[PDB]
């Protein structure tokens, strides 16, 4: 298991401008097009990643483009921040992976934001953490999803995915 096989389980793969959890416009797997109610809004910013006239639809090929960006952008991400790069750069290589992830749902900004968490992961306190994490609207709105990073926090290994 690595980070793409991760991520892909997570979020899905669809062709066609579709509706995150949260109600915004994401296309291929997981790529978030705009946070604007407008579908023609979200057409627009889709030809421009794209560079070509989409008209709402798009091929396998360039939907894992798009995913190799923005795994890329994540990982760069991470290691451009003051906040996430220590925590990063304490972790062994599969916690590394939960992070990751977390950083491509809900943004550096985000992630950064939860100050205790990262706290607790940088001291290795692995069930303080996991508790920690769960207190938060990311776990009540993507509870399953939430779970199984929690999880890989938690113990280190890919179990949670290992199922699915």
């Given amino acids: ?25 994401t296309i291929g797997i997981g790529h978030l097009l705009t946070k604007s109610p407008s579908l023609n809004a979200a057409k627009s910013e889709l030809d421009k990643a794209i560079g070509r006239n989409c008209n709402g639809v798009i091929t396998k090929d360039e939907a894992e483009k798009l995913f190799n960006q923005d795994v890329d952008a994540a990982v760069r991400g991470i290691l451009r921040n ?13 916690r590394r992976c939960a992070l990751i992830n977390m950083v491509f749902q809900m943004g550096e900004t985000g992630v950064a934001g939860f100050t205790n968490s990262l706290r607790m992961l940088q001291q290795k306190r692995w069930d303080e953490a996991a508790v920690n994490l769960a207190k938060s609207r990311w776990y009540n709105q993507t509870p399953n999803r939430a779970k199984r990073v929690i999880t890989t926090f938690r113990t280190g290994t890919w179990d949670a995915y290992k199922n699915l």
């Fill in 82 to 94: 003051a906040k996430l790069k220590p925590v990063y750069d304490s972790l062994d290589a599969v």
């Fill in 1 to 25: 298991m690595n980070i793409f096989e991760m991520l892909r389980i997570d979020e899905g793969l669809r062709l066609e401008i579709y509706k995150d959890t949260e109600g915004y416009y």
